[PDB]
Design a protein around this ligand. Structure first.
Ligand SMILES: [Mg+2]
Ligand SMILES: [Mg+2]
Ligand SMILES: [Mg+2]
Ligand SMILES: [Mg+2]
Ligand SMILES: [Mg+2]
Ligand SMILES: [Mg+2]
Ligand SMILES: [Mg+2]
Ligand SMILES: [Mg+2]
Ligand SMILES: [Mg+2]
Ligand SMILES: [Mg+2]
Ligand SMILES: [Mg+2]
Ligand SMILES: [Mg+2]
Ligand SMILES: [Mg+2]
Ligand SMILES: [Mg+2]
Ligand SMILES: [Mg+2]
Ligand SMILES: [Mg+2]
Ligand SMILES: [Mg+2]
Ligand SMILES: [Mg+2]
Ligand SMILES: [Mg+2]
Ligand SMILES: [Mg+2]
Ligand SMILES: [Mg+2]
Ligand SMILES: [Mg+2]
Ligand SMILES: [Mg+2]
Ligand SMILES: [Mg+2]
Ligand SMILES: [Mg+2]
Ligand SMILES: [Mg+2]
Ligand SMILES: [Mg+2]
Ligand SMILES: [Mg+2]
Ligand SMILES: [Mg+2]
Ligand SMILES: [Mg+2]
Ligand SMILES: [Mg+2]
Ligand SMILES: [Mg+2]
Ligand SMILES: [Mg+2]
Ligand SMILES: [Mg+2]
Ligand SMILES: [Mg+2]
Ligand SMILES: [Mg+2]
Ligand SMILES: [Mg+2]
Ligand SMILES: [Mg+2]
Ligand SMILES: [Mg+2]
Ligand SMILES: [Mg+2]
Ligand SMILES: [Mg+2]
Ligand SMILES: [Mg+2]
Ligand SMILES: [Mg+2]
Ligand SMILES: [Mg+2]
Ligand SMILES: [Mg+2]
Ligand SMILES: [Mg+2]
Ligand SMILES: [Mg+2]
Ligand SMILES: [Mg+2]
Ligand SMILES: [Mg+2]
Ligand SMILES: [Mg+2]
Ligand SMILES: [Mg+2]
Ligand SMILES: [Mg+2]
Ligand SMILES: [Mg+2]
Ligand SMILES: [Mg+2]
Ligand SMILES: [Mg+2]
Ligand SMILES: [Mg+2]
Ligand SMILES: [Mg+2]
Ligand SMILES: [Mg+2]
Ligand SMILES: [Mg+2]
Ligand SMILES: [Mg+2]
Ligand SMILES: [Mg+2]
Ligand SMILES: [Mg+2]
Ligand SMILES: [Mg+2]
Ligand SMILES: [Mg+2]
Ligand SMILES: [Mg+2]
Ligand SMILES: [Zn+2]
Lengths: 37, 100, 47, 221
RNA sequence: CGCUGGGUAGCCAAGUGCGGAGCGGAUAACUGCUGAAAGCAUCUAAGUAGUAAGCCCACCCCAAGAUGAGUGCUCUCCUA
RNA sequence: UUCACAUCGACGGGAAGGUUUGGCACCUCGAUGUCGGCUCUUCGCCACCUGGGGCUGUAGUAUGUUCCAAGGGUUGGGCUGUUCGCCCAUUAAAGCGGUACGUGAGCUGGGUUCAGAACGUCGUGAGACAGUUCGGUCCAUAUCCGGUGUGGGCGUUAGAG
RNA sequence: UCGGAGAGAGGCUCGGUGAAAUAGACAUGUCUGUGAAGAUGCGGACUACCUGCACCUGGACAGAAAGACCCUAUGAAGCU
RNA sequence: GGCCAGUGAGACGAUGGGGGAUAAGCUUCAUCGUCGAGAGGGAAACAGCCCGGAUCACCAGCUAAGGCCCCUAAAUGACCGCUCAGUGAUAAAGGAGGUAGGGGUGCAGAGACAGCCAGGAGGUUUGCCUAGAAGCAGCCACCCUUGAAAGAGUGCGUAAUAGCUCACUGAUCGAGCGCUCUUGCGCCGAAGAUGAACGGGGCUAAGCGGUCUGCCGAAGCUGUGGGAUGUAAAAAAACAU
RNA sequence: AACCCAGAGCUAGCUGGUUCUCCCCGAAAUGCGUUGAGGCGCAGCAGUUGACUGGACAUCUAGGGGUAAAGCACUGUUUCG
């Protein structure tokens, strides 16, 4: 997954969930998943 | 002028927070790569007794006497000790935060 | 990179102990009543 | 350490060749055996905290032994012997003192074996032979030919690092050669033939035990 | 070594053998199972499973001056 | 091809790092010896190869970008006093840097910073040029710390193997 | 490349003779901080029985020459 | 005014500006403080920061700045809240259903919020673009009919068909639900070279904020007892130093 | 631009050094000028002595400015309509 400092939803189906003290994006599109830092 | 102390059930010692996986006991040899980090839980399996010893040593004085004060401490993993003939007693605890 | 280190005497001004507390700074010595008039410490007898 | 099985001790006698039936050559090393190969002591966890068994070797005249050593061997009714070594195990349920250890019962044919003995003592050697350092130029005005060179960086750290590869004594210590194939047995002459080299010159003591492998024989950790 | 031709043991490599194993443990990144706060969903702020030449043990050598100086077998301590 | 974010990303903005060229001129002028190379180390990761993953405009092979990861490895030559860099043949790849641009009481002295001489140029001239050229003395028995090895003494609660 | 072996003189041991540079006193560890910005000597932690011998020199901003480069002096000298 | 000295290298900090890059432990002036010439206590060590200006003695006492788990002197004190990051030592833009609150705003017993089921049309297919598109390469436009609800139709996919699916409404189900700002403490962003390096040991209060009352704490002050200087010209006593 | 001796203890606004005790007071690193800039002279600040003075600290009041701030009425600059 692509990583950045500024993570936000890209499309409507992108959901933002915290896992292990990390803001993470989860979507059906494998491109739109992210991770902060 | 102080006294002796015996410790038992060292492996059942409590620990707050996530120090069981975060507190790093470590040591060094002298080489530029002789650093050996070790967690609480990893040390808890290898030698439970260094946990108690390493903590009390930092609280005792440092010098001739402090090295002599350390031998007055006895620590044991199990719930028994061979120092029965000395007729010890239970140690008081003024603090009220020690029992979870 | 463009932030200095504050290494010299400024390290003292920034890091010296401070209270910053009205409840701690407002305090003062404790007040007790004055004792009675005590006698002298020594007195000579005819000798 | 924990051994995979039980071994014995023998003496290097020399080295020779061994022609196979097809014609292939095999550089083989010969190991003899003295009289004594009897067990002397059996250790357990109840007494010593670990399981092992002693083994003696190289019978000698009784006068040469110190009187403490006599009582140690006379307990089990055992002949006088010079050397003593242990063999740590997992279970020692089938061993007693005054028990001989025939190698043919333990090493039949083609079995891998770990040899261990004392190496040849080279003495106070330099860095080129001990640590395989490179040599300086022999011409072009160079003054340093077989010297070490620099032994540190400079003001930082400001001291020589510990364990710096430097001269000193070389050889004369204990080593172990692993996974050597046994070629042939000869019970008539009481001798064993093993492929490959062996540390030391003829007459040197050694111990040979079954080859220990990490995940197969010994208990993993 | 007057200069050369060969050379045992010894030393030596260019020569001869061996070596680097583990379905062992715990993790990182990642993938997960089960499933709340939030009737949905979610790898997790309960729990738990896979998994790196890395980390720890295991392999080889040293080692109780480890002053925390250990353990076991055996031996000796005569005469007046 | 349409689709900002597979891969690039103008215009501008906010940072860390202390290896570049510099600013300041705080230590050293009764001395802190230089560039490169040889030998010998040892750490850092912002990862060249090797291990394990994600995404892909990833069919496959082979890539591309990026995460964990510094355990180990990172050739020999031609030219150059060199660093840098180009080239030949290979390689899994032929990584970037710190340690007084690591290391001269360990080495070399080709280069730079002495005295000789010469060309060009400047100067009436003596002479001069971070312009070039030929030549040109690198001392040292380790006191202490530190380091590689090897002994003795004493201790370890009677003394020993 | 890629070192290896051997001889001789030293080195090493014993006996005899017997210097030198140097030297504030020295009971003279490491790390990371601190400090005239680069500490055995201050702070904290770690390590470390005492004392010799033979070997190697990273540091003691080691020794050796009141810097020979640069600058200053209403200094000196040679030359034009 | 007489006799007669040294000084004329300043330093950091506060403020006011200049030069520099609103960089420098940089440099140059102005007004103050301290060090210089200043010990002591606090700041782990540390001339310039904070308290305070050492005549001397006492194994007497009260305090300042600052502190009270142990090393290491003093409450492992009390009460109301916050943080679970070893934040507590170290830096920003930016990111966020983190956490404890606060202030607006909207929705709901004539059923909200999520979940499951049903429908999700036709016409003026507007015109334009195109070989071709009923909405979905695309431009302009976005009026009307039927209805509980349906748009010149959100997304997926097709060159274009077709298709999937959304807004919306109907029922089921019964107490809460959504949108947008905001405060405090924290998370990511936050990577370096010999080795924990942030006093240590360690602590979920032994951290942060507010509040009350005790105590420790300097060569300061008080108490007791001496010396010296000046007033001062003999002593003494006194005041100040 | 030899060596020895003498002038010569040449000169050195530059380094280094300069020896017992107690008591009292106690600086300055600023300005002007300088063939001067790490030197010197004068002023400023010390000590000592003498003369003449009554202020210092604190409080209030008065007096003239043209800084901060503020502003666009002048001088310049500038956005939109
Ligand atoms: Mg910086
Ligand atoms: Mg106070
Ligand atoms: Mg030998
Ligand atoms: Mg070579
Ligand atoms: Mg030579
Ligand atoms: Mg040092
Ligand atoms: Mg020959
Ligand atoms: Mg010959
Ligand atoms: Mg699931
Ligand atoms: Mg569920
Ligand atoms: Mg969990
Ligand atoms: Mg592995
Ligand atoms: Mg640097
Ligand atoms: Mg620089
Ligand atoms: Mg010197
Ligand atoms: Mg990395
Ligand atoms: Mg440099
Ligand atoms: Mg260098
Ligand atoms: Mg050197
Ligand atoms: Mg040269
Ligand atoms: Mg001319
Ligand atoms: Mg030449
Ligand atoms: Mg030399
Ligand atoms: Mg010595
Ligand atoms: Mg030594
Ligand atoms: Mg020789
Ligand atoms: Mg010889
Ligand atoms: Mg001699
Ligand atoms: Mg010592
Ligand atoms: Mg500093
Ligand atoms: Mg330092
Ligand atoms: Mg001291
Ligand atoms: Mg120290
Ligand atoms: Mg040497
Ligand atoms: Mg020197
Ligand atoms: Mg000089
Ligand atoms: Mg000179
Ligand atoms: Mg002058
Ligand atoms: Mg000046
Ligand atoms: Mg202003
Ligand atoms: Mg300055
Ligand atoms: Mg300056
Ligand atoms: Mg002062
Ligand atoms: Mg500090
Ligand atoms: Mg008090
Ligand atoms: Mg506090
Ligand atoms: Mg206390
Ligand atoms: Mg912390
Ligand atoms: Mg912290
Ligand atoms: Mg701390
Ligand atoms: Mg509080
Ligand atoms: Mg005093
Ligand atoms: Mg006083
Ligand atoms: Mg003279
Ligand atoms: Mg004269
Ligand atoms: Mg005074
Ligand atoms: Mg001045
Ligand atoms: Mg001043
Ligand atoms: Mg003039
Ligand atoms: Mg002047
Ligand atoms: Mg002057
Ligand atoms: Mg001066
Ligand atoms: Mg001058
Ligand atoms: Mg003057
Ligand atoms: Mg203004
Ligand atoms: Zn998405």
């Amino acid at each position: 997954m692509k990583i950045r400092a500024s993570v936000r939803p890209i499309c409507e189906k992108c959901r933002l969930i915290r896992r292990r003290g990390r803001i993470i994006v989860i979507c059906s599109n494998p491109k739109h998943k992210q991770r902060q830092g | 002028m102080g006294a002796f102390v015996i410790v038992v059930n060292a492996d059942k010692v409590a620990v707050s927070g996530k120090k069981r996986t975060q507190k790093l006991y470590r040591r060094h040899s002298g080489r530029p790569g002789g650093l050996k980090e070790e967690t609480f839980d990893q040390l808890q399996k290898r030698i439970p007794e260094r946990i108690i010893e390493h903590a009390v040593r930092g609280m005792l004085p440092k010098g001739r006497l402090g090295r002599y004060l350390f031998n007055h401490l006895k620590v044991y993993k199990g719930a028994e000790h061979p120092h029965q003939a000395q007729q010890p007693i239970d140690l008081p605890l003024r603090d009220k935060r020690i029992r979870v | 990179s463009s932030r200095p280190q504050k290494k010299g005497t400024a390290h003292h001004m920034k890091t010296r102990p401070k209270k910053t507390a009205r409840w701690d700074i407002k305090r003062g010595p404790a007040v007790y009543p004055p004792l009675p008039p005590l006698p002298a410490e020594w007195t000579i007898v005819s000798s | 350490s924990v051994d995979a099985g039980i071994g014995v001790m023998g003496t290097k006698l020399g080295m020779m060749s061994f022609f196979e039936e097809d014609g292939t050559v095999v550089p083989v090393t010969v190991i003899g055996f003295k009289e004594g190969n009897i067990v002397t002591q059996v250790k357990t966890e109840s007494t010593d905290g670990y399981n092992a068994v002693q083994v003696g070797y190289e019978r000698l005249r009784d006068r040469k032994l110190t009187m403490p050593e006599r009582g140690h061997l006379n307990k089990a009714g055992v002949i006088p012997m010079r050397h003593l070594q242990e063999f740590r195990l997992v279970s020692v349920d089938d061993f007693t003192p005054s028990q001989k250890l025939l190698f043919e019962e333990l090493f039949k044919e083609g079995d891998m074996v770990d040899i261990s003995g004392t190496t040849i003592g080279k003495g106070f050697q330099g860095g080129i032979k001990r640590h395989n350092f490179k040599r300086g130029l022999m011409t072009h005005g160079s003054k340093s030919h077989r010297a070490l060179g620099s032994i540190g960086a400079g003001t930082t750290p400001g001291h020589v690092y510990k364990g710096k590869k430097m001269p000193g004594r070389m050889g004369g210590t204990k080593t172990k050669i692993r996974k050597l194939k046994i070629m042939k047995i000869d019970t008539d002459l009481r001798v064993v033939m093993i492929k490959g080299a062996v540390p030391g010159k003829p007459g040197n003591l050694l111990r040979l035990a079954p080859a220990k492998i990490v995940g197969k024989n010994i208990p993993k950790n």
